[PDB]
């Protein structure tokens, strides 16, 4: 239903910003492999959020 | 330093469990494309956490 849909969109939005923050922390730490993986994680978090927005936005 | 490293590990652990929860919600909603993407997101969140654990664990 629309409230469950909105929970899921918000959580996708949230997760996308968390992964950006994690990217930033791993770059601040100069942890090169982990940063590269986190950067990919964030790109995928962004893909998920746009797709969830598209359907339930 | 070790406390910054531990912040980053915890946040990776957190993000991994959030993405599993998001996967579960999108499957509960029967939103097939978004679920497939979330499933991939979670696999990547798990890759990040293991790699961060490996380095800073």
mmCIF file of C-alpha atoms in Angstrom:
data_model
loop_
_atom_site.group_PDB
_atom_site.id
_atom_site.type_symbol
_atom_site.label_atom_id
_atom_site.label_comp_id
_atom_site.label_asym_id
_atom_site.label_seq_id
_atom_site.Cartn_x
_atom_site.Cartn_y
_atom_site.Cartn_z
ATOM 1 C CA UNK A 1 0.000 0.000 0.000
ATOM 2 C CA UNK A 2 1.162 3.571 -0.312
ATOM 3 C CA UNK A 3 2.555 3.799 3.257
ATOM 4 C CA UNK A 4 4.621 0.655 2.903
ATOM 5 C CA UNK A 5 5.796 1.995 -0.488
ATOM 6 C CA UNK A 6 6.802 5.290 1.098
ATOM 7 C CA UNK A 7 8.702 3.384 3.896
ATOM 8 C CA UNK A 8 10.669 1.672 1.228
ATOM 9 C CA UNK A 9 11.444 4.840 -0.702
ATOM 10 C CA UNK A 10 12.588 6.640 2.401
ATOM 11 C CA UNK A 11 14.779 3.748 3.342
ATOM 12 C CA UNK A 12 16.298 3.716 -0.113
ATOM 13 C CA UNK A 13 16.935 7.475 0.179
ATOM 14 C CA UNK A 14 18.443 6.919 3.597
ATOM 15 C CA UNK A 15 20.660 4.092 2.470
ATOM 16 C CA UNK A 16 21.961 6.140 -0.416
ATOM 17 C CA UNK A 17 23.086 8.943 1.842
ATOM 18 C CA UNK A 18 24.639 6.516 4.353
ATOM 19 C CA UNK A 19 26.714 4.916 1.646
ATOM 20 C CA UNK A 20 27.964 8.340 0.493
ATOM 21 C CA UNK A 21 28.978 9.081 4.083
ATOM 22 C CA UNK A 22 30.704 5.735 4.319
ATOM 23 C CA UNK A 23 32.556 6.487 1.066
ATOM 24 C CA UNK A 24 33.727 9.825 2.568
ATOM 25 C CA UNK A 25 34.948 8.180 5.793
ATOM 26 C CA UNK A 26 36.870 5.492 3.919
ATOM 27 C CA UNK A 27 38.487 8.093 1.714
ATOM 28 C CA UNK A 28 39.286 10.177 4.808
ATOM 29 C CA UNK A 29 41.016 7.060 6.156
ATOM 30 C CA UNK A 30 42.955 6.536 2.859
ATOM 31 C CA UNK A 31 41.772 2.937 2.648
ATOM 32 C CA UNK A 32 41.958 2.559 -1.074
ATOM 33 C CA UNK A 33 40.359 -0.795 -1.855
ATOM 34 C CA UNK A 34 37.530 -0.290 0.576
ATOM 35 C CA UNK A 35 36.860 3.168 -0.856
ATOM 36 C CA UNK A 36 36.603 1.772 -4.364
ATOM 37 C CA UNK A 37 34.115 -0.805 -3.229
ATOM 38 C CA UNK A 38 32.115 1.803 -1.213
ATOM 39 C CA UNK A 39 32.019 3.999 -4.314
ATOM 40 C CA UNK A 40 30.499 1.198 -6.261
ATOM 41 C CA UNK A 41 28.090 0.504 -3.336
ATOM 42 C CA UNK A 42 26.909 4.107 -3.454
ATOM 43 C CA UNK A 43 26.342 4.015 -7.223
ATOM 44 C CA UNK A 44 24.159 0.950 -6.686
ATOM 45 C CA UNK A 45 22.365 2.588 -3.742
ATOM 46 C CA UNK A 46 21.608 5.523 -6.135
ATOM 47 C CA UNK A 47 20.394 3.124 -8.843
ATOM 48 C CA UNK A 48 18.003 1.510 -6.290
ATOM 49 C CA UNK A 49 16.642 4.863 -5.075
ATOM 50 C CA UNK A 50 15.924 6.193 -8.552
ATOM 51 C CA UNK A 51 14.204 2.995 -9.518
ATOM 52 C CA UNK A 52 12.079 2.910 -6.322
ATOM 53 C CA UNK A 53 11.253 6.624 -6.866
ATOM 54 C CA UNK A 54 10.274 5.881 -10.430
ATOM 55 C CA UNK A 55 7.746 3.183 -9.343
ATOM 56 C CA UNK A 56 6.437 4.591 -6.121
ATOM 57 C CA UNK A 57 7.370 8.268 -6.332
ATOM 58 C CA UNK B 1 43.077 5.864 13.850
ATOM 59 C CA UNK B 2 41.440 2.846 15.404
ATOM 60 C CA UNK B 3 38.263 4.697 16.503
ATOM 61 C CA UNK B 4 37.643 6.155 13.073
ATOM 62 C CA UNK B 5 38.312 2.666 11.639
ATOM 63 C CA UNK B 6 35.789 1.140 14.024
ATOM 64 C CA UNK B 7 33.193 3.857 13.045
ATOM 65 C CA UNK B 8 33.604 2.798 9.492
ATOM 66 C CA UNK B 9 33.292 -0.911 10.209
ATOM 67 C CA UNK B 10 30.177 -0.413 12.265
ATOM 68 C CA UNK B 11 28.659 1.694 9.561
ATOM 69 C CA UNK B 12 29.443 -0.957 6.992
ATOM 70 C CA UNK B 13 27.827 -3.575 9.263
ATOM 71 C CA UNK B 14 24.843 -1.300 9.704
ATOM 72 C CA UNK B 15 24.465 -0.615 6.021
ATOM 73 C CA UNK B 16 24.568 -4.301 5.231
ATOM 74 C CA UNK B 17 21.694 -5.065 7.550
ATOM 75 C CA UNK B 18 19.666 -2.084 6.284
ATOM 76 C CA UNK B 19 19.986 -3.275 2.724
ATOM 77 C CA UNK B 20 18.796 -6.770 3.719
ATOM 78 C CA UNK B 21 15.774 -5.169 5.385
ATOM 79 C CA UNK B 22 15.136 -3.092 2.301
ATOM 80 C CA UNK B 23 15.345 -6.247 0.160
ATOM 81 C CA UNK B 24 12.730 -7.900 2.439
ATOM 82 C CA UNK B 25 10.357 -4.913 2.227
ATOM 83 C CA UNK B 26 10.598 -4.747 -1.560
ATOM 84 C CA UNK B 27 9.928 -8.451 -1.831
ATOM 85 C CA UNK B 28 7.016 -8.072 0.604
ATOM 86 C CA UNK B 29 5.685 -5.419 -1.787
ATOM 87 C CA UNK B 30 6.173 -7.726 -4.845
ATOM 88 C CA UNK B 31 8.131 -5.030 -6.660
ATOM 89 C CA UNK B 32 10.197 -7.276 -8.831
ATOM 90 C CA UNK B 33 12.742 -5.025 -10.525
ATOM 91 C CA UNK B 34 13.447 -3.054 -7.396
ATOM 92 C CA UNK B 35 13.910 -6.270 -5.423
ATOM 93 C CA UNK B 36 16.458 -7.546 -7.912
ATOM 94 C CA UNK B 37 18.413 -4.347 -7.652
ATOM 95 C CA UNK B 38 18.172 -4.343 -3.803
ATOM 96 C CA UNK B 39 19.454 -7.922 -3.805
ATOM 97 C CA UNK B 40 22.460 -6.853 -5.747
ATOM 98 C CA UNK B 41 22.859 -3.815 -3.412
ATOM 99 C CA UNK B 42 22.938 -6.134 -0.410
ATOM 100 C CA UNK B 43 25.548 -8.423 -1.986
ATOM 101 C CA UNK B 44 27.727 -5.354 -2.515
ATOM 102 C CA UNK B 45 27.043 -4.103 1.027
ATOM 103 C CA UNK B 46 28.252 -7.566 2.234
ATOM 104 C CA UNK B 47 31.350 -7.362 0.015
ATOM 105 C CA UNK B 48 32.179 -3.927 1.550
ATOM 106 C CA UNK B 49 31.705 -5.141 5.137
ATOM 107 C CA UNK B 50 33.906 -8.201 4.731
ATOM 108 C CA UNK B 51 36.612 -6.151 3.119
ATOM 109 C CA UNK B 52 36.479 -3.435 5.829
ATOM 110 C CA UNK B 53 36.494 -6.204 8.495
ATOM 111 C CA UNK B 54 39.475 -7.794 6.821
ATOM 112 C CA UNK B 55 41.519 -4.532 7.001
ATOM 113 C CA UNK B 56 40.355 -3.059 10.249
ATOM 114 C CA UNK B 57 38.814 -6.026 12.052
#
